[PDB]
Symmetry: C2
Subunit: 397 residues, 2 copies
């Protein structure tokens, strides 16, 4: 169907096309500079000017102006002192406004985006956020609504964020697709590290990577990855780009990983397929790798997580792509898992799968939660669609 | 092979192995051993000493050995057993899962030591499994870890022969430190053999 909002946008003939707002810091994070690179389109007039103004609330802190000259791209660098850093604990927000204004000063078009000051980088095998190691207490938030299918609205989104922050969840992985555009805005506003996931999934194909190695699907995969990256680069909450969930490790994933690392080098790129340890992955993210028991499968083994840490020539950090299946009265071994997470420095938590129960309301007229196969559908997967920490109507499990 | 260097009782441990006035003596005690025992093929790992404290003399001697005979890895346990003066990380009595975080000389769990950031050198246990009489406990646990973890490559069960001297009452009876009137001594701590002094199996 059409499961998201349909809008109508009107722009003048000359308009602002694209702009990427990056950030770099010094050693002590006291001094930082903002790169509000901006592009435009249409007829180019010498009198055209752009202005990037940084407002800490109602008060303007830093600003800059520059004419065009790429003849349609202009670079602005704004110095910021003692910036209020951004982290899941403290969602400090800067409202940066980009203005397309005339030489005499009349405003043609103005665009703005919330910008947070944070750094995410990999060194020595640790994921550093603002110079500090991270502890990812994640969750796989599936997009599902009890009475509207996959239609998502602000009330449900806000309530989910509230419940998620009330239980010390400071990480979310949109599974397995980019979420509603306002979701990321609310994530920046409240403070929640997000791991965006490109909509790529070919699990049932035999073998797994029969498609992601054929270079005839590079156009489609590149579209599905690059459009997500371009649309969601500015948000500061999104920390880790993920190229998909176990989609099989071919050559297209290597190509797209290198493209992402070339376009936005400020974010580590995780990808779970092909044993989750290929060259197409910066953050080793296996699925259901047990703590001490070893599961040596052919070509896709599930080591014990500590053994995976102690693999020869392996220095990248490990976060669990999926772990702790929450099937009803479940979430077992959590502690064991959290004991390992707290003991081992390079093991940095996982994403409890999953948040919301994908149950559709069926009327007998008494509503009763149903699963796959109760609508007459076949083939189905029975109650395997019921793995939520809360019910569909958000009653806590 | 282990060079005859031991200054455990000195306070602090590396008060001597950092003073460059002892470089002559330490260099003699290391280089003469290396030169005398290089040809033998059985000798695989040169060890510069047991926890003698990590100063600068150990770095100098390690580089000298690696320059003279580059066919053998050099292990040395002192200074946390993870310094630049050691190719084979060899801690003493590092437990399997329990962690022992001592100041400046901690005893990580061996798996954590394996999973330390920026650490790629293999780990062999310099000493482990004290065989004090009816002891050799956790051996299995230890051997389970050794077999599971590829970069953990076993240890050296301390120790082989019981250092017991024969005392006559005329019936010979095995004695330890302090039974000859010696003081200070360390009682029965000299009795850590897998076999007796006359090689009767424990």
């Amino acid at each position: 169907g059409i499961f998201r909002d349909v809008s109508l946008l009107h722009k003048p003939t000359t308009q602002i096309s694209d702009f990427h707002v990056a950030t770099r810091f010094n050693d002590d994070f006291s001094r930082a500079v903002l790169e509000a690179e901006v592009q435009m389109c249409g007829e180019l007039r010498d009198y055209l000017r752009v202005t990037v103004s940084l407002w800490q609330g109602e008060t303007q802190v830093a600003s800059g102006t520059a004419p065009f000259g790429y003849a349609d791209r202009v670079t602005l660098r704004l110095n910021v002192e003692n910036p209020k850093l951004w982290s899941a604990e403290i969602p400090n927000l800067y409202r940066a406004v980009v203005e397309l204004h005339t030489a005499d000063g009349t405003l043609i078009e103005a665009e703005a985006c919330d910008v947070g000051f944070r750094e995410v980088r990999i060194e020595n095998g640790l994921l550093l956020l603002n110079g500090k190691p991270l502890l990812i207490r994640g969750v796989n938030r599936h997009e599902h609504h009890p009475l509207h299918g996959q239609v998502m609205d602000e009330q449900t989104m806000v309530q989910d964020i509230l419940l998620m922050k009330q239980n010390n969840f400071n990480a979310v992985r949109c599974s397995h697709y980019p979420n509603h555009p306002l979701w990321y805005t609310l994530c920046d506003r409240y403070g929640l590290y997000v791991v965006d996931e490109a909509n790529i999934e070919t699990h049932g194909m035999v073998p797994m990577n029969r498609l992601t190695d054929d270079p005839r699907w590079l156009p489609a995969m590149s579209e599905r990855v690059t459009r997500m990256v371009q649309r969601d680069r500015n948000h500061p909450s999104v920390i880790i780009w993920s190229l998909g969930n176990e989609s099989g490790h071919g050559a297209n994933h290597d190509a797209l990983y290198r493209w992402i690392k070339s376009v936005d080098p400020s974010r580590p790129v995780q990808y779970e397929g092909g044993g989750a340890d290929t060259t197409a992955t910066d953050i080793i993210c296996p699925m259901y790798a047990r703590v001490d028991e070893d599961q040596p499968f052919p070509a896709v083994p599930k080591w014990s997580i500590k053994k995976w840490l102690s693999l020869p020539g392996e220095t990248r950090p490990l976060i669990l792509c999926e772990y702790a299946h929450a099937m009803g009265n479940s979430l077992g071994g959590f502690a064991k898992y959290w004991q390992a997470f707290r003991q081992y420095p390079r093991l940095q938590g996982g994403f409890v799968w999953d948040w919301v129960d994908q149950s559709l309301i069926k009327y007998d007229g008494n509503p009763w939660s149903a699963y796959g196969g109760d609508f007459g559908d076949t083939p189905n997967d029975r109650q395997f669609c019921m793995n939520g920490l809360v019910f569909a109507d958000r009653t806590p499990h």
